């Protein structure tokens, strides 16, 4: 009810009367604890555990922090842009713990967390980059219940490589009957990578919403979208056409407008 | 760029069975799904099934419902395709190809191998 929830998929103006609309909204919108993932924790409201995750384009590493402390994963790869200075102290498998993690690390010692750093300046670190995979799939469990992803870039960039990182993954580097749910950061002004999304991965899953947290910015088009329910048949076919999904963005971004409007984003 | 090497055609009686391989190499996570396709004489490319090397797999053909199946070695990137209870209808070059995206036109896929005969005696 309070929750900003659209189904990704589930009579319909034009292609170009949606691309129109879009505009309109996301210029509206212009003109309108540190260490905790408040965002991915409200985008996770129906789960409680996890036990084994991939994490991309962590940043400082909130997210994988939030997945072991409340989720209880056991096992986890981190990758993020961020390296460290080589005089930081605390390593995991020789490789430096970014700051926000070092809360976790009585756990590696006591034999109970394994984490996987993708963090080195002597790693290929950018999931966009071609050979990324190449360069870390030997260190990715190939296990993971949870897959997230939580690049942030500038609005109207075409993010559909770092959903190509993802979508490699699901196609060459996980267990179908383990996976659970995939996470990914979106930006609403990327309708390119959008659609990539419609074409690639949503038809991978039987459920797909977009969640707004009400600790995300009310003037970003930034979104999140859970997929679950990997699907046993692979499908070879679209859940719905390039049309219906801009029609789905356009009621995405009509409903923050609203909820903005209103006057409502929590952060302080 | 991805190859692709086919094996484990031939000749076959009716009723008997053949399994075939689409060894694989180059950039194959970027080609993900791996389907089986063949091509009878002046007949158009038919979709067999395809599965992706994380083991997916897409419906089978209603022509081969229940006798054929596919299957993959991920770590010899390599995909099989089990074809049981043979008929003269089975006869084609059998194709290997590699895509993006699980679709059943033969246009979707840029890799190919060269394909492997399939000959059913009556
Ligand atoms: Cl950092
Ligand atoms: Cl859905
Ligand atoms: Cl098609
Ligand atoms: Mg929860
Ligand atoms: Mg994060
Ligand atoms: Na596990
Ligand atoms: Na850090
Ligand atoms: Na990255
Ligand atoms: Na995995
Ligand atoms: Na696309
Ligand atoms: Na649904
Ligand atoms: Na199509
Ligand atoms: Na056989
Ligand atoms: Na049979
Ligand atoms: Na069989
Ligand atoms: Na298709």
């Given at each position: 009810?309070?929750?900003?929830?659209?189904?990704?998929?589930?009579?319909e103006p034009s292609p170009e009367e949606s691309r129109s609309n879009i505009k309109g909204l996301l210029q509206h919108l212009r003109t309108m604890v540190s260490s905790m993932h408040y965002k991915l924790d409200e985008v996770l409201w129906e789960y409680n555990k996890f036990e084994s995750?991939?994490?991309?384009?962590?940043?400082?590493?909130?997210?994988?922090?939030?997945?072991?402390?409340?989720?209880?994963?056991?096992?986890?790869?981190?990758?993020?842009?961020?390296?460290?200075?080589?005089?930081?102290?605390?390593?995991?498998?020789?490789?430096?713990?970014?700051?926000?993690?070092?809360?976790?690390?009585?756990?590696?010692?006591?034999?109970?967390?394994?984490?996987?750093?993708?963090?080195?300046?002597?790693?290929?670190?950018?999931?966009?980059?071609?050979?990324?995979?190449?360069?870390?799939?030997?260190?990715?469990?190939?296990?993971?219940?949870?897959?997230?992803?939580?690049?942030?870039?500038?609005?109207?960039?075409?993010?559909?490589?770092?959903?190509?990182?993802?979508?490699?993954?699901?196609?060459?580097?996980?267990?179908?009957?383990?996976?659970?749910?995939?996470?990914?950061?979106?930006?609403?002004?990327?309708?390119?990578?959008?659609?990539?999304?419609?074409?690639?991965?949503?038809?991978?899953?039987?459920?797909?919403?977009?969640?707004?947290?009400?600790?995300?910015?009310?003037?970003?088009?930034?979104?999140?979208?859970?997929?679950?329910?990997?699907?046993?048949?692979?499908?070879?076919?679209?859940?719905?056409?390039?049309?219906?999904?801009?029609?789905?963005?356009?009621?995405?971004?009509?409903?923050?407008?609203?909820?903005?409007?209103?006057?409502?984003?929590?952060?302080? | 760029?991805?190859?692709?090497?086919?094996?484990?055609?031939?000749?076959?009686?009716?009723?008997?069975?053949?399994?075939?391989?689409?060894?694989?190499?180059?950039?194959?996570?970027?080609?993900?799904?791996?389907?089986?396709?063949?091509?009878?004489?002046?007949?158009?490319?038919?979709?067999?099934?395809?599965?992706?090397?994380?083991?997916?797999?897409?419906?089978?053909?209603?022509?081969?419902?229940?006798?054929?199946?596919?299957?993959?070695?991920?770590?010899?990137?390599?995909?099989?395709?089990?074809?049981?209870?043979?008929?003269?209808?089975?006869?084609?070059?059998?194709?290997?190809?590699?895509?993006?995206?699980?679709?059943?036109?033969?246009?979707?896929?840029?890799?190919?191998?060269?394909?492997?005969?399939?000959?059913?005696?009556?």
């Amino acid at each position: 009810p309070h929750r900003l929830v659209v189904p990704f998929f589930k009579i319909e103006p034009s292609p170009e009367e949606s691309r129109s609309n879009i505009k309109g909204l996301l210029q509206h919108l212009r003109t309108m604890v540190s260490s905790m993932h408040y965002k991915l924790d409200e985008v996770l409201w129906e789960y409680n555990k996890f036990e084994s995750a991939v994490t991309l384009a962590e940043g400082e590493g909130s997210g994988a922090l939030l997945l072991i402390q409340k989720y209880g994963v056991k096992k986890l790869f981190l990758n993020t842009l961020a390296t460290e200075h080589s005089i930081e102290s605390e390593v995991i498998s020789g490789y430096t713990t970014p700051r926000m993690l070092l809360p976790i690390m009585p756990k590696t010692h006591r034999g109970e967390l394994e984490v996987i750093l993708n963090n080195s300046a002597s790693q290929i670190t950018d999931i966009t980059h071609r050979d990324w995979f190449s360069n870390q799939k030997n260190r990715i469990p190939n296990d993971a219940d949870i897959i997230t992803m939580d690049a942030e870039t500038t609005e109207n960039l075409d993010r559909s490589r770092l959903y190509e990182a993802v979508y490699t993954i699901i196609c060459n580097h996980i267990n179908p009957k383990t996976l659970k749910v995939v996470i990914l950061k979106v930006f609403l002004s990327d309708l390119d990578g959008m659609c990539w999304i419609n074409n690639y991965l949503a038809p991978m899953f039987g459920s797909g919403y977009l969640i707004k947290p009400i600790t995300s910015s009310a003037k970003s088009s930034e979104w999140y979208l859970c997929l679950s329910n990997l699907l046993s048949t692979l499908r070879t076919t679209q859940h719905q056409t390039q049309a219906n999904c801009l029609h789905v963005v356009q009621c995405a971004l009509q409903q923050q407008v609203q909820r903005g409007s209103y006057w409502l984003h929590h952060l302080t | 760029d991805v190859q692709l090497v086919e094996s484990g055609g031939g000749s076959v009686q009716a009723g008997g069975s053949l399994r075939l391989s689409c060894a694989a190499s180059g950039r194959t996570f970027s080609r993900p799904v791996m389907a089986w396709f063949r091509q009878a004489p002046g007949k158009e490319r038919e979709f067999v099934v395809a599965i992706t090397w994380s083991g997916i797999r897409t419906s089978y053909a209603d022509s081969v419902k229940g006798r054929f199946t596919i299957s993959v070695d991920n770590a010899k990137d390599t995909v099989y395709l089990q074809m049981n209870s043979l008929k003269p209808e089975d006869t084609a070059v059998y194709y290997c190809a590699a895509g993006a995206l699980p679709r059943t036109a033969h246009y979707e896929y840029d890799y190919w191998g060269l394909g492997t005969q399939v000959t059913v005696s009556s």
